[PDB]
Each structure stands twice: as C-alpha cells, then as structure tokens.
Write a protein that binds this ligand. Structure first.
Ligand SMILES: *[C@@H]1O[C@H](CO)[C@@H](O[C@@H]2O[C@H](CO)[C@@H](O)[C@H](O)[C@H]2NC(C)=O)[C@H](O)[C@H]1NC(C)=O
Ligand SMILES: *[C@@H]1O[C@H](CO)[C@@H](O)[C@H](O)[C@H]1NC(C)=O
Lengths: 66, 101, 253, 101, 51, 51
C-alpha cells in the first residue's frame, strides 16, 4: 500500500530506539546517584531509608524554596 | 520566427511553366523528397550535450560577492561608529562644554 | 512538511512533549540540581529548581530547533536526557535537509518529452490523432523513418486512442496522458485560451492556407499582389494578434 | 528594548542565539514559532543551493524577441542594409519599432 | 547523497524502460502468439524487443 | 554536490550502464568480426555504442 516517499519508521525509526535506550538508562542512573547521595548523607546521618524519605518528601511538595 | 516569407522557383511574367512547377513542388511534399533534401544538405555533424559536470570548489566567480556585502558591512559599521560617538559627546554636552574635550 | 511523512511529524512533537515530561520528573527527582541562584547568597534555604513544566517544555523545543535555551542542567541524570535528545535533534534536522534536497534534485532533473523523436520511443504516452483526414494521411503516405514508426503505434490502436474530433481530442488530453496531433494553427488557438496546454515540438509539415480561385481566374495574380503587400505593412501579422490572443497565461507570472 | 528585540530577530535567524530568552508565555511562543521558522528557511536554502550544484539547468538570458526588447546590455545589430534590416524599418509593430530605435 | 540515487530507481513499470535495459532479460513462449506478435508488429519500442 | 555526482555515476556494470556515459573509452579493434556485429546490430543499446 506504498513504495516509500518521505522517510518513515522503516527508514529513520531506529533513532527512536536509541532515544528509548537513553531515557531508560537515565532513570537507572537517576536512582544510582540518589542512594549515593543518601550514602553521602549517611556519613553524619543515620540509616539512609528515612533520609531518602526526606529526599522523597522534597519531591512531593514541588515548590521547595528551602 | 518573426516573418513568414518564402523562397520560390520563379518564372518570367506570363510564363507557362509556372503552373507546371506549381504542380511540381505541391507533389514533392507528400512523397517527402523535398523534406528529405532538407535532411540532405543541412545536417552534417550533430551537437553533443552530456556528462553533468559538478561545480568543483566554488571560487570568487561563484561565491565572491558574499565578501562584497561583508565589505559593505564593515564600512557601514565604522560610519555608525562615529555616528553614536558624537551623539554621546552631545549626550555628555548637557553637562559638558567645548565638545572637542 | 513534504520531505517527511506525517507519521513522523505526529510523533516528534509528541516526543518533544514526551522528553519534556520525562526530564521534568528526573529534575525533581535528582539532588544535583539545587545550587545557589544569585551565588552571593550566604544560606541554605535558597535552593533552586528552575526546571518547570513550562521550562521542560521550553528546553525541548529550544534544543529541537537548534537554537539553545537557558536551562543548562548539572545532574548527570538530567544531562543524559538532554544528551540523547541532542543526538535525536541532529538526525531529524539533517535528514530534513537531506530529503528536501532530494525533492529539488530530482524535480530539476525531470525533463519532459520535447521533440517528435522524444515521443518516438514512449509508448507509455499514446499518440492518437484527429479523424481520418488531413493530419492522419500525412503519416500514412510518409516514408520518414521517424513518422513511419508513429504510424505503427496508431495501427495497433484503433478504436479510441484515435478520436474523431478536435474538441474530443482536446478533452482526451485534459483527462489522460494523451498527446494530440493537430494542425499547428488551432493548437495556438486552444493553448492561448486554456493555459493548461502547451505546443510541444516544432513544426513537422509546412503547408499553408490560401485565398484560392477557380481555374484560370484572372483575380488570382491580383490577389497574389495583395497578400504580398500585406506582409510589409504588417496588417496581416496584426490580424494574427487580433483573433488569437485573448487571455494570456501566468507562465510569465 | 527596541534594539534588543531587533537583536533577537537576527541572532535567532543566524543560528547563534542571544541573551534575551524569555520566561512569560506571551514572548515564549513568538520566540518558539520563529525558531521553527528558521530551520525551514536555512535548510531549504542549503537544499536549493545543493540542488543547483548537481544537475545544472542551463538557461539563456533572452528567450523571445520580447526578452531582447529590454536588454540594451545585449546588443542587437543585424546583417547589411537589405532583406533583414528593412523589415524592421518598414514595420509598425510596437516591439520591432523599439528594436529599430 | 543516499536519498537521490534511491529516488531515480524505476522498478520498471512500462515496457519502454524494459526495452532499454538489456541487463534484465525478456521472455516469451517460443513460437507462440507472442513471437507471432512482436515480429509482425512495426512499433518502434516493440521492434527493439524483437531484435 | 560532490557526493551526489559520484554516486549517480555507478561503476561499469554491463553494456547498459557502459552505453550511457562516454567518459570510459569504448573498446573495439578496427575491422574485426566483433566490430562487424556492432555495425549491423539492430538493438539501439548496441547501436548507441556504434553511434
Ligand atoms: C498530472 O495532472 C493530471 C491532471 O490533473 C493528472 O491526470 C489524471 O489522470 C488520470 C488517469 O486516468 C485521470 O483519471 C484523472 O482524471 C486525471 N486528473 C484530472 C484532474 O483530470 C495526472 O495524474 C497528474 N500526474 C501525472 C504524473 O501525470
Ligand atoms: C485549467 O486551468 C483552469 C484555470 O487555471 C482551471 O480552472 C482548471 O481546473 C484547469 N484544468 C484542470 C483539468 O485542472
């Protein structure tokens, strides 16, 4: 129902796959440095669960200014 | 083609060969020997056109006028450099005297 | 929009909406995006998150159009998002420059049929002619090797590639890829007053229309002196501009 | 300002950027649609200039007698005083009269 | 440079390009109505096919 | 522009592609049985070689 005219997924669509590979790798390194800073907090703090809760309490309010 | 006159056989005035030649040429166009002689004495060589040559390495003959509008830019820039220079010297001169200073 | 398919266009602005919402989450999620705005500020309760849903939408469209913004993240998890999105931008625009080059380099190469010899090979474009008569029987009685091969195409294709009327042949060109053969005068009358037609090719035959007399009539030379006067003072060519041009065409526009 | 708004109207077109990049929606979209405008101009200009340097479409300066009616850069001339010339002199055609001038 | 040689490809549609390219080959049942036709025709394109 | 003229012009594949461009010199010993074939051939693809 075609031959080709104008650069479809059959031509260019693999650039979205390496885009999809980028976003998935970005979230995986998002939690990678998240518990790292929770360990960088844990030099003076306690166990990094409730310290990460403050690191997730700050995500909840969405207007921090603190 | 601007004009549409034509070349003819031609006779003297009142010559009776004229209609016999009027029947002659008007025969030659159907059997095509008249147009065949147009292909006889006119085409001798033929002309070529080929090879689609690339415009290798654009010179001044191609692109060099972009330097002229570049040259028009720098000259206009210095002219408006002194244009605002004495303007600010006048903007100074509501506090300042002897605007050469 | 023609150098790209609209399936790409309908996703890529949604992908810009897509990368806007994803980067906005990670910016709120990461701790390395909270430095000091106005860095002279000597305190702790001043942490910034200049990333907004407005700004995450803005960094997408700002980077996609190859211009820049003022977003400039610091966290690696927010930098890899913009990093691959920069690698997606460079492809989709350079491909857009490629295919827009591709349309304009094949349309300029596209040369139509020009001469009678150019129609000698194309059996895709069908000749035809007018009704059996003046234009036709020149081809049949010819011995020209080009025009003989034209007659062979018309020999195999009777019953309506060979139409029987002028305006029917005008109608057959205007619908299909038909290429009508015709007396060169009445082509100039239709092409002037259609602006959808063109006289392709030159002039095959060179016969002419005359005043004409009966046999032996003595008015003939008096009319032979007549027309041969009309061409110098130009009233004959002035009447060629009288009854032929009526509209003009926007080919010059 | 009136200078900077003009300054954003050039540097954004020239693929350079500036330091004006707004925050209110009313000035964002004007900057947004200009950024979509500036790739359709330049890349097509890159496409068309790449379209010239490949498949060269040779053209003549004039095409008709009317095209030579205005160009006094290209000079007419003719043959010796006679057959081709005196058609132009004895004409009353407004195109060819200007050729005789 | 890729998308311009890919455009001009004619996945041959009519017999006229099929009359030009002698790389790809024609075909007919021998001494059929097809050999009867393209011999006894005089058409410019089809005579090149008979040759 | 360089890369769109160097890729349209394919290398020498067969007598079809070798007929169109004339930059590559056609090969013929004068007055041979090979040249006898191409002077009397009727396929225009082979006659464009002869032309
Ligand atoms: C060029 O334009 C013509 C006219 O618009 C197109 O001609 C069509 O041809 C088909 C063939 O049977 C007819 O059914 C249509 O009715 C024609 N169109 C019209 C508006 O009459 C043609 O398709 C166009 N393209 C090409 C490549 O020739
Ligand atoms: C011919 O041109 C006229 C005026 O431009 C237009 O109205 C008409 O649709 C054209 N013919 C076809 C078949 O499109």
């Amino acid at each position: 129902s075609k031959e080709a005219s104008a650069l479809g997924v059959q031509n260019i669509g693999g650039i979205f796959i390496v885009l999809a590979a980028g976003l998935v790798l970005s979230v995986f390194v998002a939690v990678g440095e998240f518990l790292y800073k929770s360990k960088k907090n844990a030099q003076l703090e306690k166990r990094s669960f409730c310290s990460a809760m403050v690191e997730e309490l700050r995500m909840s309010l969405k207007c921090q200014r603190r | 083609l601007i004009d549409s006159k034509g070349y003819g056989v031609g006779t003297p005035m009142g010559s009776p060969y004229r209609d016999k030649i009027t029947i002659a040429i008007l025969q030659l166009q159907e059997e095509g020997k008249l147009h065949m002689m147009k292909e006889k004495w006119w085409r001798g060589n033929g002309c070529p056109e080929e090879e689609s040559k690339e415009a290798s390495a654009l010179g001044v003959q191609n692109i060099g006028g972009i330097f002229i509008v570049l040259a028009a830019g720098l000259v206009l820039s210095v002219f408006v450099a002194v244009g605002e220079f004495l303007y600010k010297s006048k903007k100074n001169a509501q506090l300042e005297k002897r605007s050469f200073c | 929009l023609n150098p790209l398919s609209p399936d790409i266009w309908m996703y890529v602005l949604l992908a810009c909406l897509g990368v806007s919402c994803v980067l906005f989450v990670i910016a709120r999620f990461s701790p390395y995006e909270w430095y000091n705005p106005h860095p002279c500020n000597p305190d702790s309760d001043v942490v910034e998150n200049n990333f907004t849903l407005l700004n995450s939408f803005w960094f997408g469209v700002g980077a996609l159009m190859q211009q820049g913004s003022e977003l400039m993240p610091k966290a690696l998890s927010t930098r890899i998002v913009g990093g691959i999105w920069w690698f997606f931008t460079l492809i989709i625009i350079s491909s857009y420059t490629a295919n827009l080059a591709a349309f304009l380099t094949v349309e300029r190469m596209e040369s139509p049929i020009d001469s009678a010899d150019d129609l000698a090979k194309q059996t895709k474009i069908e000749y035809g002619a007018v009704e059996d008569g003046a234009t036709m029987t020149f081809f049949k009685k010819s011995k020209i090797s080009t025009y003989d091969k034209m007659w062979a195409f018309m020999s195999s294709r009777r019953q309506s590639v060979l139409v029987k009327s002028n305006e029917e042949g005008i109608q057959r060109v205007l619908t299909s890829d038909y290429a009508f053969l015709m007396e060169s005068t009445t082509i100039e009358f239709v092409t002037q007053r259609n602006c959808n037609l063109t006289q392709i090719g030159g002039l095959i035959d060179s016969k002419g229309y005359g005043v004409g007399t009966p046999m032996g009539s003595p008015y003939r030379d008096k009319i032979t002196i007549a027309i041969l006067q009309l061409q110098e003072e130009g009233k004959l060519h002035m009447m060629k501009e009288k009854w032929w041009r009526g509209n003009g065409c926007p080919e010059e526009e």
